[PDB]
PDB file of N, CA and C in Angstrom:
ATOM      1  N   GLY A   1       6.420   2.318 -10.090  1.00  0.00           N
ATOM      2  CA  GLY A   1       6.967   2.710  -8.798  1.00  0.00           C
ATOM      3  C   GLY A   1       6.533   1.776  -7.708  1.00  0.00           C
ATOM      4  N   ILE A   2       5.409   2.084  -7.084  1.00  0.00           N
ATOM      5  CA  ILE A   2       4.884   1.269  -6.005  1.00  0.00           C
ATOM      6  C   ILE A   2       4.420  -0.089  -6.505  1.00  0.00           C
ATOM      7  N   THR A   3       5.063  -1.088  -6.005  1.00  0.00           N
ATOM      8  CA  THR A   3       4.886  -2.437  -6.433  1.00  0.00           C
ATOM      9  C   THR A   3       4.516  -3.279  -5.221  1.00  0.00           C
ATOM     10  N   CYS A   4       3.789  -4.336  -5.438  1.00  0.00           N
ATOM     11  CA  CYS A   4       3.392  -5.201  -4.367  1.00  0.00           C
ATOM     12  C   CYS A   4       3.917  -6.600  -4.566  1.00  0.00           C
ATOM     13  N   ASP A   5       4.996  -6.903  -3.909  1.00  0.00           N
ATOM     14  CA  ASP A   5       5.546  -8.242  -3.938  1.00  0.00           C
ATOM     15  C   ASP A   5       4.917  -8.968  -2.790  1.00  0.00           C
ATOM     16  N   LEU A   6       4.702  -8.218  -1.748  1.00  0.00           N
ATOM     17  CA  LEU A   6       4.050  -8.664  -0.599  1.00  0.00           C
ATOM     18  C   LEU A   6       2.662  -8.065  -0.635  1.00  0.00           C
ATOM     19  N   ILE A   7       1.735  -8.743  -0.103  1.00  0.00           N
ATOM     20  CA  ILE A   7       0.395  -8.259  -0.046  1.00  0.00           C
ATOM     21  C   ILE A   7       0.086  -7.900   1.381  1.00  0.00           C
ATOM     22  N   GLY A   8      -0.117  -6.630   1.624  1.00  0.00           N
ATOM     23  CA  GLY A   8      -0.418  -6.158   2.972  1.00  0.00           C
ATOM     24  C   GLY A   8       0.844  -5.950   3.800  1.00  0.00           C
ATOM     25  N   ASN A   9       1.793  -6.858   3.661  1.00  0.00           N
ATOM     26  CA  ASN A   9       3.063  -6.828   4.427  1.00  0.00           C
ATOM     27  C   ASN A   9       4.069  -5.973   3.695  1.00  0.00           C
ATOM     28  N   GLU A  10       3.579  -5.336   2.685  1.00  0.00           N
ATOM     29  CA  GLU A  10       4.344  -4.575   1.768  1.00  0.00           C
ATOM     30  C   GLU A  10       4.592  -3.159   2.316  1.00  0.00           C
ATOM     31  N   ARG A  11       5.419  -3.101   3.341  1.00  0.00           N
ATOM     32  CA  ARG A  11       5.767  -1.861   4.043  1.00  0.00           C
ATOM     33  C   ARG A  11       6.428  -0.859   3.104  1.00  0.00           C
ATOM     34  N   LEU A  12       7.131  -1.369   2.107  1.00  0.00           N
ATOM     35  CA  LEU A  12       7.784  -0.529   1.113  1.00  0.00           C
ATOM     36  C   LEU A  12       6.744   0.237   0.295  1.00  0.00           C
ATOM     37  N   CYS A  13       5.542  -0.282   0.236  1.00  0.00           N
ATOM     38  CA  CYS A  13       4.470   0.433  -0.390  1.00  0.00           C
ATOM     39  C   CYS A  13       3.784   1.348   0.642  1.00  0.00           C
ATOM     40  N   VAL A  14       3.509   0.791   1.841  1.00  0.00           N
ATOM     41  CA  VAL A  14       2.833   1.515   2.949  1.00  0.00           C
ATOM     42  C   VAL A  14       3.527   2.859   3.260  1.00  0.00           C
ATOM     43  N   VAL A  15       4.859   2.841   3.270  1.00  0.00           N
ATOM     44  CA  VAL A  15       5.663   4.028   3.564  1.00  0.00           C
ATOM     45  C   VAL A  15       5.368   5.170   2.575  1.00  0.00           C
ATOM     46  N   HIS A  16       5.024   4.821   1.341  1.00  0.00           N
ATOM     47  CA  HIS A  16       4.701   5.810   0.324  1.00  0.00           C
ATOM     48  C   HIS A  16       3.420   6.535   0.712  1.00  0.00           C
ATOM     49  N   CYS A  17       2.474   5.779   1.192  1.00  0.00           N
ATOM     50  CA  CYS A  17       1.216   6.317   1.629  1.00  0.00           C
ATOM     51  C   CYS A  17       1.442   7.224   2.839  1.00  0.00           C
ATOM     52  N   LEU A  18       2.286   6.769   3.754  1.00  0.00           N
ATOM     53  CA  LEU A  18       2.597   7.526   4.959  1.00  0.00           C
ATOM     54  C   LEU A  18       3.390   8.792   4.625  1.00  0.00           C
ATOM     55  N   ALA A  19       4.209   8.720   3.592  1.00  0.00           N
ATOM     56  CA  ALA A  19       4.994   9.857   3.141  1.00  0.00           C
ATOM     57  C   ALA A  19       4.088  10.922   2.555  1.00  0.00           C
ATOM     58  N   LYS A  20       3.075  10.482   1.818  1.00  0.00           N
ATOM     59  CA  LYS A  20       2.095  11.401   1.253  1.00  0.00           C
ATOM     60  C   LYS A  20       1.222  12.004   2.342  1.00  0.00           C
ATOM     61  N   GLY A  21       0.957  11.234   3.368  1.00  0.00           N
ATOM     62  CA  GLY A  21       0.166  11.740   4.465  1.00  0.00           C
ATOM     63  C   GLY A  21      -1.095  10.953   4.667  1.00  0.00           C
ATOM     64  N   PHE A  22      -1.111   9.760   4.142  1.00  0.00           N
ATOM     65  CA  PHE A  22      -2.219   8.862   4.309  1.00  0.00           C
ATOM     66  C   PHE A  22      -2.132   8.168   5.640  1.00  0.00           C
ATOM     67  N   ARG A  23      -3.265   7.648   6.100  1.00  0.00           N
ATOM     68  CA  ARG A  23      -3.324   6.855   7.330  1.00  0.00           C
ATOM     69  C   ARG A  23      -2.459   5.625   7.160  1.00  0.00           C
ATOM     70  N   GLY A  24      -2.326   5.200   5.922  1.00  0.00           N
ATOM     71  CA  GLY A  24      -1.536   4.064   5.618  1.00  0.00           C
ATOM     72  C   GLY A  24      -1.886   3.535   4.277  1.00  0.00           C
ATOM     73  N   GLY A  25      -1.336   2.418   3.946  1.00  0.00           N
ATOM     74  CA  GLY A  25      -1.544   1.849   2.669  1.00  0.00           C
ATOM     75  C   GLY A  25      -1.479   0.376   2.747  1.00  0.00           C
ATOM     76  N   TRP A  26      -1.944  -0.273   1.728  1.00  0.00           N
ATOM     77  CA  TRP A  26      -1.966  -1.696   1.692  1.00  0.00           C
ATOM     78  C   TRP A  26      -2.071  -2.147   0.257  1.00  0.00           C
ATOM     79  N   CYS A  27      -1.580  -3.302  -0.003  1.00  0.00           N
ATOM     80  CA  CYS A  27      -1.747  -3.897  -1.283  1.00  0.00           C
ATOM     81  C   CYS A  27      -2.909  -4.821  -1.201  1.00  0.00           C
ATOM     82  N   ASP A  28      -3.826  -4.684  -2.104  1.00  0.00           N
ATOM     83  CA  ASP A  28      -5.022  -5.497  -2.050  1.00  0.00           C
ATOM     84  C   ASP A  28      -4.817  -6.774  -2.846  1.00  0.00           C
ATOM     85  N   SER A  29      -5.862  -7.567  -2.954  1.00  0.00           N
ATOM     86  CA  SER A  29      -5.841  -8.821  -3.681  1.00  0.00           C
ATOM     87  C   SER A  29      -5.441  -8.644  -5.160  1.00  0.00           C
ATOM     88  N   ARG A  30      -5.671  -7.462  -5.714  1.00  0.00           N
ATOM     89  CA  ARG A  30      -5.308  -7.175  -7.099  1.00  0.00           C
ATOM     90  C   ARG A  30      -3.822  -6.872  -7.240  1.00  0.00           C
ATOM     91  N   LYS A  31      -3.087  -6.915  -6.105  1.00  0.00           N
ATOM     92  CA  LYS A  31      -1.639  -6.657  -6.063  1.00  0.00           C
ATOM     93  C   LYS A  31      -1.353  -5.186  -6.336  1.00  0.00           C
ATOM     94  N   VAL A  32      -2.354  -4.369  -6.102  1.00  0.00           N
ATOM     95  CA  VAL A  32      -2.265  -2.950  -6.322  1.00  0.00           C
ATOM     96  C   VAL A  32      -2.078  -2.239  -4.994  1.00  0.00           C
ATOM     97  N   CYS A  33      -1.236  -1.237  -5.015  1.00  0.00           N
ATOM     98  CA  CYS A  33      -1.007  -0.372  -3.892  1.00  0.00           C
ATOM     99  C   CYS A  33      -2.163   0.594  -3.721  1.00  0.00           C
ATOM    100  N   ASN A  34      -2.783   0.561  -2.577  1.00  0.00           N
ATOM    101  CA  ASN A  34      -3.871   1.454  -2.278  1.00  0.00           C
ATOM    102  C   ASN A  34      -3.521   2.181  -1.005  1.00  0.00           C
ATOM    103  N   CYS A  35      -3.766   3.453  -0.955  1.00  0.00           N
ATOM    104  CA  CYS A  35      -3.519   4.218   0.255  1.00  0.00           C
ATOM    105  C   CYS A  35      -4.833   4.747   0.783  1.00  0.00           C
ATOM    106  N   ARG A  36      -5.103   4.540   2.090  1.00  0.00           N
ATOM    107  CA  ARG A  36      -6.327   5.026   2.754  1.00  0.00           C
ATOM    108  C   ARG A  36      -6.405   4.462   4.169  1.00  0.00           C
ATOM    109  N   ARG A  37      -6.023   3.213   4.310  1.00  0.00           N
ATOM    110  CA  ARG A  37      -6.161   2.498   5.555  1.00  0.00           C
ATOM    111  C   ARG A  37      -4.804   2.272   6.161  1.00  0.00           C
TER     112      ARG A  37
END
């Protein structure tokens, strides 16, 4: 599902975090979607 083509600029991932109710999300250096920030 959540994929990181962009790192950090990956709003398509960030929106998932925001949809869940997270402060936000970001793709880290591992190209993994993380939600918290």
